[PDB]
Each structure stands twice: as C-alpha cells, then as structure tokens.
Swiss-Prot record, chain A:
Coiled coil: none annotated. The chain holds residues 1 to 117 of 146 of the full protein. Contacts the 16S rRNA of the 30S subunit (part of bridge B6), connecting the 2 subunits. It comes from Thermus thermophilus (strain ATCC 27634 / DSM 579 / HB8). This is Large ribosomal subunit protein bL19. Part of the 50S risobomal subunit. Contacts protein L14. Forms a bridge to the 30S subunit in the 70S ribosome, contacting the 16S rRNA. The lineage of its organism: Bacteria, Thermotogati, Deinococcota, Deinococci, Thermales. Keywords: Ribonucleoprotein, Ribosomal protein, RNA-binding, rRNA-binding. The gene is rplS. The keyword Magnesium does not apply. Belongs to the bacterial ribosomal protein bL19 family.
From Swiss-Prot, chain C:
Belongs to the bacterial ribosomal protein bL17 family. It comes from Thermus thermophilus (strain ATCC 27634 / DSM 579 / HB8). Gene3D superfamilies: Ribosomal protein L17. This is Large ribosomal subunit protein bL17. GO terms for biological process: translation. Keywords: Ribonucleoprotein, Ribosomal protein.
UniProtKB/Swiss-Prot annotation, chain D:
Pfam families: Ribosomal_L3. PANTHER family: 50S RIBOSOMAL PROTEIN L3, LARGE RIBOSOMAL SUBUNIT PROTEIN UL3C. Part of the 50S ribosomal subunit. Forms a cluster with proteins L14 and L19. InterPro entries: Ribosomal_uL3, Ribosomal_uL3_bac/org-type, Ribosomal_uL3_CS, Transl_B-barrel_sf. One of its GO terms (cellular component) is cytosolic large ribosomal subunit. The gene is rplC. It comes from the Bacteria. Keywords: Ribonucleoprotein, Ribosomal protein, RNA-binding, rRNA-binding. It comes from Thermus thermophilus. HAMAP family: Ribosomal_uL3_B. Belongs to the universal ribosomal protein uL3 family. GO terms for molecular function: rRNA binding; structural constituent of ribosome. GO terms for biological process: translation. This is Large ribosomal subunit protein uL3.
Curated annotation (Swiss-Prot), chain E:
This is Large ribosomal subunit protein bL32. It comes from Thermus thermophilus (strain ATCC 27634 / DSM 579 / HB8). It comes from the Bacteria. GO terms for molecular function: structural constituent of ribosome. Coiled coil: none annotated. InterPro entries: Ribosomal_bL32, Ribosomal_bL32_bact, Ribosomal_zn-bd. One of its GO terms (cellular component) is large ribosomal subunit. Part of the 50S ribosomal subunit. Keywords: Ribonucleoprotein, Ribosomal protein.
RNA sequence: ACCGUGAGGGAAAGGUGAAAAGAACCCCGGGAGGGGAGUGAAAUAGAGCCUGAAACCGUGGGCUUACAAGCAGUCACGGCC
RNA sequence: GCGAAUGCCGGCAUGAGUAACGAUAAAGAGGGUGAGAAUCCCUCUCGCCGUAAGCCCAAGGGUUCCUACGCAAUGGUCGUC
RNA sequence: CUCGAUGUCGGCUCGUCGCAUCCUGGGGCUGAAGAAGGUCCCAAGGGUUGGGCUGUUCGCCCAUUAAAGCGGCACGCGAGCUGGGUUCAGAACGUCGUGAGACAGUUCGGUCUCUAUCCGCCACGGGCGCAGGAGGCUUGAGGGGGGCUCUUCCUAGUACGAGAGGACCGGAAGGGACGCACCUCUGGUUUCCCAGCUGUCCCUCCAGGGGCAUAAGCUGGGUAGCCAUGUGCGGAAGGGAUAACCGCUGAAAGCAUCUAAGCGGGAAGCCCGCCCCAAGAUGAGGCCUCCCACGGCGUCAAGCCGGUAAGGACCCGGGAAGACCACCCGGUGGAUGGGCCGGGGGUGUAAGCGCCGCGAGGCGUUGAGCCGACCGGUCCCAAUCGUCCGAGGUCUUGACC
C-alpha cells in the first residue's frame, strides 16, 4: 500500500498522462510551445527549439535543458506534465551514447563538434 | 547565479560588456546580484571610444546560470551572466544590445524598453 | 547526515567484496562454514545472490558470477552440483546460525552458516 | 478543528494556472476513545486513535479502556482540549474542508550529535592560517571573573534529532474523501510514512 | 596537563566503579538436552532444534 | 649489578627451625597451586618461610543514607544496637 | 624524642580499569596439534613489496644456529610460538 | 593580593549585561503649515551590512543602509584557535658611543604543550522515590524559543496649497535578514550503481572478466538517504495592567488645578495569546482500563516465600530513534529482517551469434544488459525452545452505603 499506492494515485489524479507525448529520445533537438504567458493573459504557444539534454522521472518529471544557440548559449529546462505545455514535437534524432547531461554540447560544443556527436 | 564582487557581462552601450559590481541594490544586506535584480558597479573591461567610460552605474539583472526558477514552473538557464546598465531612473543605457526574451525580465517589468529591445536569436 | 542507512558493512569496500567472495567460495566448498556474527549475516546476503545465478543457470549467468568468483572447479561445481538442488525454492538459500561460543582474546561471537538444506 | 494522522509522503502538484508542491496526509478516522467531560477533566476535550495494529497483540487494559464506550481494534492514540465531538467517530471525508488554512505538526526526524557545526548555525571556525582544528570547531564559553566560570545555556553539540515539533500556518489545498487523504503543501514536519497531527488556529488579522 | 586535585576518597572512586557494577549471563535449558543455552544457540551436546549437526567426535 | 666514551659512579639481600624430621601418600588441576595424612611442642614456625605493626585493597557483621547545601566538627538531645 | 624542609630511602595509593600497543602494506576459509589455540602447523582463497620490504660482502653483535624436550619470567594480553 | 608564577596587543569564534537609544516607537516643543528637520522625558524589543589601506581596535575612503550606537566582563575569551605584533641571540642601516654596546628609529626571519579530577554547561541513561500492583491519555503553576524593517500602491493627490509638495487615520501587495521544519521541485553528493579508458601481472591464447594503479587508478552521468544555492512557514492578532505625555469629576488654595479622593486616554515594553520543555513542581499526579486479597513464623510480623503475562523485563530480530543506553515495532497464530518477485529510478543497448569493411570497427537480435538504501507482494531463510521479576494492599480521622 502506502506511498507507492496512495500517492501514485493522487497524482494520476491531477497530471493524468502529462498528455501522452512519450517522445523522449536522448538526442533530438526538437521544438514546442508552452503556454508560458503574462501581460493580458498572453499565454503564448511559445515554441523553443533545443537540443535535448536531460530529465526528471516520476509524477513530476521534466524535459530538460535542451540547449539552444540563440546568439549566446541559452539552455531551456521544462517540467513534463506541467499543464504548462501544449505543442511538443520532435525534429531531431534520438541518437548518441553516454547518456544525458552530455552538456559536452553547451560547453565546448563548436557547431562542427556538435554535428560530430 | 549571484555574486557580490563581480565580473559580469552586459552589452548595452557598454565600455565593455563587463563591469564589476559591488553588491545588490535591494534590502540592505545584499549577497545576491540575482536574476532580474538591480545593483551596483564600475567597469572592468575596456571601451573603444563610446561615451560610456571607466565609471560606475547601477542596473538590472539578466541571465545567471544556476536556476532561473519561475512562478509557472517555467524553467531555464543560459551559460551566460549579464545585465543591462542603467542611467539613474533605471532608464537603460544604450540604443540597443545583444540578447533576448523570457519572463523574469519583463516580469520584473520596469524596463519594458529592454523588453521589446532585445528580442531575436541571440 | 547519517542514520537512514542500507547495506551495512565494515573494513573497506575492496576488502569487503574481497571477503564476501573468498568466503562465498569456501562455503560453496563446504556447504557450511564457521565465522563471526555478521560475517555470516551479510555473507548470507551475498553468497546468497550468487547461488541465485547458480540457479539462473545459463551460459550468461555463469559467465557473470564466475566474473566474481573466478575458477571453474567451483564455477560448475555450484552451477550444476547444487544449483539444481535448489532451483525451485524462493531464495533464502542461506542458513545463518549462532554457535556456542566466542573466539578467544576477545569473545567475538561466532557461528556457522551454510546452504540451507 | 483538528485532524489525526499518519503522515504519508511529500510530492508536487499543480493548482490554478501554475504548479507548486504538496504533501500527503492520510487518516482513516479516529474516534471518541476517551472524553474529558470537563466535570471529568475540566480541561475538557477529545482523545482518539486512528487505525489498528494487530489484535492478537493487545494488553487487557487496552482491551477494556476501549470497552469504555467501546470502539475498535488499534493503537494509535492521543488527545486535544477545547474540541467538541459533534460525533462519536470522525474521518475528515469532510472533517477537513479544502481551500482553508491550517496549522499542523508532527514527530521531528532524528538528527545526530554535531556541534557548533550542526546543532546551531554558523558553520564552525575557519581554515588555513590555522589547521590545528582545520575549518570548524566549538566557539567560546565564558570567562575569568566575569561570571567567573563557564556559562549555562548557549547552544551545544550533539543529539539534536530525536525530538518533536510543529509548523504554523500551511494550506489545506485538497481533499480526497475516499482514501481518507489530503494534500497540503507542507513543511513535511518530521518524517513521513509516520506520525503527525493537524489543528487550526489563527485569528490572524493579516 | 590537567591532573585533578586529590581523589574525593575511595568514596568517589566507588561512586564511579559502583554505578559501574558487573551484571550476569542470560540462559535457559537446551531445547534438546539440558544445561544452559542462551537464546538462539546449540552446543557440545544437543546442538540443534532441527539437526544437531554438532557435537561428539 | 648496573650508567657513562673513557676518566669515572657506584645498590641492594642478614635470620625457616632446637635438631631437618623441610614434607612419601591419597584427593581439583596443564601447571602451578589447593583439601586431607604425617611433622611437631607451634607451622597464623612452612622455604624467602622469626618478631612479622602503620598504608592500601579486600570477605562478613552493627549503626547509618535519595527534598539535600558541611573541613570539619562538635554541645545538646531523640531513635537504634 | 620531630607534620613538617617541592626533604632522605622504601613501600602504597591517583586519575584509569578512560590514553595507549610503535606505522591505514587488509586479510577469509578448511583440516591439524594441543589442558587451551584471533594470535602455532599444513594447505586453499586474498592484498603489499620487487627496486624493494631483493639477495650479497663487509661492520659490528657476539650469542646464537640446529635437534629435542618446557613456558611459571619475556614479548608491549595471547600463546601448546 | 601576585615575582614557587596572573599570557600583555590585533583578530578570530561563541558572546553576555548596560543605557547617558543609533534605527526603532510614545511622546509634549519649535523660530512646528506640509513634508522634512531640529529640542528634551519615557522605553532596550529586534535590529544595530560589504570592501579598501593600514598587524593597528581608531581612523580616513568606496557602496549602500531604516540604521549602519557608546560600553561594561583583566581593554571576555591559550586549558578555544590565531599569533603580523611590540619584547631573547641574528643581520640591516639610519643614530649615540673613544668602542665594547646601545635607540619606545626602523626594517627581514623569530621552536604556543595541553590524555578533564572537582563545581559549571550539553546530552543521554542507570536509582529510588511522589505508601495497592498495573497499560495508556492528559493539565499545566514554572521554565525555554521568536518578537526587525524596507519599498510599491488605494484611499488620496483632496488635509497644507501661491507654487514646487506631500498627511495623520486606515487599507492592500512585493522584499531583505534572520529562526523552524522539509525534499516534491531546483541543484550537491552517491568508495561500487551503471557506463567509457591507458598500463599491467593473472585466468585458460581470442574475445570475457580479474586485483593494482589511494585507503575507488582515471573519466561521465547517477537515485535513495543526508543536504543549499531549492520548498512550506514564522516574526499576528488580539486581551488586561502602564512609561513620558493627555484628560474627567474635585476640594485643601468660599475663582483656578488631572489631583491625596475616585474615573478614563496611552507606548513595537510588562503578564497572557504564539510554539518547546515540565511533579524528582516529594505540593497533584487528574482521567481512563485492569489483576484481586496466596502460603508459613514473637505484632504497629510497612521481614522473610511461590504467586496473576494484570504487566513487563530478559534474548532474538528489525528501526530516518540511535556512541553505549533508554525511545520504537515486531518474534513465526508473523511480514521483522535478509531472499526472492513484481515494480519505480538509475545506467546506456550487454554476453553471443548473426549480417558490410583487407582492417579499424559498423549494423542486427537491444533503448538490451545490470543494478544499494525507494512502493509494495510472497513464511524461500532466520525471528524455536525458554527465563525472571514483578498487588495484596500503614496508622488516623471525617463522609456516605
């Protein structure tokens, strides 16, 4: 019973699936739109593209910093169910080894290297 | 994420996108040039011409790297540390500047100009 | 800091694994062996999992625990010698039990523990 | 205004248009195990239990203390004053309405025995120009002829975990009437999967 | 460096040695033969509960 | 003896008994050592063993002691024995 | 004829059954011999040396080395080593 | 007193009281319009930042700040550090000295020990007791913890107004610092969780592994626990006495006065309200339930024995509780551990054979493989058997039946 049980439950309650979207993939830079908004309920299907970085897993989870070269390096981290989300579509490839936090990217990247993977 | 003494980045009418702040402009007990805050500093880095100089202003907090945790559980981090220089009132320094969007900023609000100003990729 | 603690042991992880094994081995040899209180306790947990693969019974499994004990004689010795004998119960193939006395000089409480027939 | 509970675990949730985090309160439902009538204990109040751990295991006394107004077969019990029992059995399946403010407490997870380091704030001493004590150690303790000795009540090393305590206001967030559970966004006062209680006081004028 | 002052008499010495004191050894009889057995144990005789597997040689 | 390189410094320990008759032998024990038999005038004269006290630690008994602040004590008195 | 002189010589106390065992180069098993074996013997797992924890000549030590019995003293407890 | 011995500076760390109170408020006063100052009496509540240079505390300076106080305790702190210091020999010169040597002129280095006995503080236990023997729930006299402050805005830009400018009263939101808990989330760890790697001796050559490369050789990530830099919360109300200071009713001073008389106003302070201890408060225990008056002896038989599992202790086995200990749940009529199993979350597609390349390896079966503390199943194993201690119920008075 206990924890596992009851809790599993309440969450199931609220989050339900984070909106069946189960497209994780390690690599894949990809793109989405979160409601993220302010100013006159300007909740905007805002879409950021980002090279897939990491994640938290259980009730509460999060599609991690996918780093995005904006013109400086900006990495974007976002909670998974987090009703906050609407569109979440992949573009990139779910490839590469050593598993996540492979910031190798954000760090010494270098477009070339980037592609080097 | 924060700092007192600091080698920070900017990109306004900068002498150089870099100045060292003393501390936080908030509630007398600084300890955090924190995201979206306002604080104190002088230049560290050079400045071709430019009316900027090797002085000291105060201004407002951009980027950080160690958790931009927002109200909506919006989350982010840029491998960059920088804010925009202020002229008194706050009224920003330069005509433009190299950087972009995201809540925290506008949210602090007082600086809409910065707001519309740094938009696109970079 | 410390309190809520799992897998509880002494000496030094290398020393330990060292023992766990050496012992797991010697017991495998004699069915029953004599040492000190937890020597047994934990040794149970361990030689324990080993017999578990002993049972596992297959080219791979074999490959593994061998990975750990290093040496055919026993390798097979267990894997086929008794692994069958057990393959059918629900683990706990260990019988850890408190002898009559305590080694000298100190009074270290000891016992015999073995494959539980 | 009081709930008796088996504190579950802490977890995150969402509200309005934003996530935030809560905690899992669970309580079958204590019952009038003992009443201090006032003429009884002019410190008038209600004592209750809220579960049941094995019956084959149970002192006679317990058996009949229960006998009293007779109720069930548990062991979790305690008391609180100035709280009527407009019932003779309580659950919370409503007992505790959400969108309300609460106060609550519980057992306090059990620390260890760490000095100036733990126990109190300020992490020890310093480290380098001095290492015949490297980084931290005990502050100072009194003096020559001031009191002429060693003081009597400043913080002190050691055991500072096996105790109990509570938290002031917190939010009632949500009510799950079935599995007698409630999410409250709380300082998980003390462990979890263990013991706690809630009470509500706050004539607080903002 | 900090050698006391004297010794509050055997008196004290005791006070201490005293709260100290030496208790005795737990035991019941062999679940099998007789003599003293501490809780879970066997010995140079009976030696069991299900298979002496012990004593005599 | 023993410290110092050498020069050199430089302890301690006297007695069992009257005479050896100073301990066959039996018994717990690896042994020591421990109970007996014999010694004898004694062996609380038993081998470091005459006389063998103070100090300190011990086994039993008497009185005494858990709301107590005093070198000590001690004058008084009351309860124990 | 003596408290008394941080006295002189010899006992006997005290913190203390806490500080400490001389290197963080680890050891675990099985059987053996024994009055008793963590601490001896074989044998089996295992770590640390190896450029030394190698061997070698020499110095200086001067018993001991061996083989056989024994352990009350001695090893910083063990201990049939 | 001290020379049979008392460590002197500066700083550190933990500070503790004090008011001639700095910020706080309460105030009468103004040369007080407002605002803002400034002028005294009351009141320590909390609070009473960073750096710079200087061995200097003082100080001067940078930036803020509500504010960035004076000082008591051998100028608190060496049995708790630090030790630049001035103050053992050096050597330096600058300076005296006929020179030996010297200068509170200076400058470079310059061997600070500490196994706690006492009373004292921090904790945790063993007693023995608060005259039945018991399992458990309480109420607190009395003691402990925290009581700070900024800015935005409504009222409200009207009270003041020439104007520039800003108000009692009272009401919202955000924050700094700090105190209390706590991991979901955020990030930190994770000596074995997983994964990659060189060198090397070993297994059996090949792969597939193995110890050593620290007590993990190295690397990249990594639960769970613990933990900030992450999260909730808190410093309130509000009740009663009052400080300065304001008044009511009123004489003695046949007009007057707050003034002994009698009444009220009033401070972020005092008692409470807030949490945390607590009858070893011998002045409790209050309530609940429950076992009943056993045997034999000189009597106030308040001494000796089995006694009730009434209950508990012991041993075992388990614990975010934990040095030991006590606390806590359990012992097989159980799930308590470990085991196993299902599952989470970890690693990042194994081992082999198979498919393209002389080869390096590449692709397939593979997001496989292997896994420690996290939810929970199932007696696979080990919580067997036992033991011991633990009421009979003082005298006395009053009351009821």
């Amino acid at each position: 019973m206990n924890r596992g049980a009851l809790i599993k439950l309440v969450e199931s309650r609220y989050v339900r699936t984070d909106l069946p979207e189960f497209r994780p993939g390690d690599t894949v830079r990809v793109s989405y739109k979160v409601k993220e908004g302010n100013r006159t309920r300007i909740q905007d299907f805002e879409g950021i593209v980002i090279r897939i970085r990491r994640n938290g897993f259980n009730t509460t989870f999060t599609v991690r910093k996918v780093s995005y070269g904006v013109g400086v390096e900006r990495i974007f981290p976002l909670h998974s169910p987090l009703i906050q989300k609407i569109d979440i579509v992949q573009r990139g490839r779910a490839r590469r080894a050593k598993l996540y936090f492979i910031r190798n990217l954000s760090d010494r990247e270098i477009r070339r290297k980037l592609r080097a993977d | 994420m924060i700092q007192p003494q600091t080698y920070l980045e900017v990109a306004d009418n900068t002498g150089a996108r870099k100045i060292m702040c003393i501390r936080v402009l908030k509630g007398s007990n600084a300890k955090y040039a924190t995201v979206g805050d306002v604080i104190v500093a002088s230049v560290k880095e050079a400045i071709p011409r430019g009316a900027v100089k090797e002085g000291d202003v105060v201004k407002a907090v951009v980027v950080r790297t160690k958790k931009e945790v927002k109200r909506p559980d919006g989350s982010a981090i840029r491998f960059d540390d920088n804010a925009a220089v202020i002229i008194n009132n706050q009224l920003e320094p330069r005509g433009t500047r190299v950087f972009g969007p995201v809540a925290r900023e506008l949210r602090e609000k007082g600086f809409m100009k910065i707001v519309s100003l740094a938009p696109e990729v970079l | 800091r410390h309190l809520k603690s799992g897998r509880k042991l002494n000496r030094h992880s290398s020393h330990r694994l060292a023992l766990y094994r050496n012992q797991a081995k010697s017991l495998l040899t004699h069915g029953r062996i004599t040492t000190t209180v937890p020597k047994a306790k934990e040794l149970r947990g361990f030689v324990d999992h080993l017999i578990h693969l002993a049972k596992r019974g297959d080219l791979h499994a074999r490959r593994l625990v061998l990975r750990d004990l290093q040496d055919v004689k026993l390798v097979r010795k267990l894997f086929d010698e008794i692994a069958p004998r057990y393959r059918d119960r629900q683990g706990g193939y260990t019988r850890v039990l408190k002898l009559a006395e305590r080694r000298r000089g100190d009074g270290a409480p000891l016992a015999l523990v073995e494959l539980v027939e | 205004m009081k709930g008796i509970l088996g504190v579950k675990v802490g977890m995150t949730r969402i509200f309005r248009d934003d996530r935030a985090v809560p905690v899992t309160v669970i309580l079958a439902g204590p019952c009038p195990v003992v009443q201090r009538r006032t003429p009884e204990k002019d410190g008038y109040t209600a004592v209750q239990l809220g579960f049941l751990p094995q019956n084959p295991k149970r002192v006679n006394r317990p058996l009949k203390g229960h006998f009293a107004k007779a109720g069930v077969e548990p062991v979790r019990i305690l008391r609180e004053i100035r709280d009527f029992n407009p019932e003779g059995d309580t659950v919370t399946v409503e007992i505790f309405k959400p969108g309300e403010r609460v106060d609550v407490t519980g057992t306090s997870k059990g620390r260890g025995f760490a000095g100036v380091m733990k126990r109190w704030n300020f992490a020890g001493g310093p480290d380098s120009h001095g290492a015949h004590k490297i980084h931290r150690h005990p502050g100072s303790i009194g003096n020559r002829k001031t009191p002429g000795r060693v003081y009597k009540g400043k913080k002190m090393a050691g055991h500072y975990g096996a105790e109990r305590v509570t938290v002031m206001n917190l939010e009632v967030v949500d009510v799950i009437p079935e599995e007698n559970l409630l999410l409250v966004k709380g300082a998980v006062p003390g462990p979890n999967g263990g013991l706690v209680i809630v009470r509500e006081t706050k004539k607080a004028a903002k | 460096h900090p050698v006391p002052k004297k010794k509050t008499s055997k008196a004290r010495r005791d006070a201490r040695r005293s709260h100290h004191a030496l208790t005795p050894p737990t035991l019941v009889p062999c679940p099998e033969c007789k003599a003293m057995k501490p809780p879970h144990t066997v010995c140079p005789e009976c030696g069991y509960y299900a298979g002496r597997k012990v004593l005599e040689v």
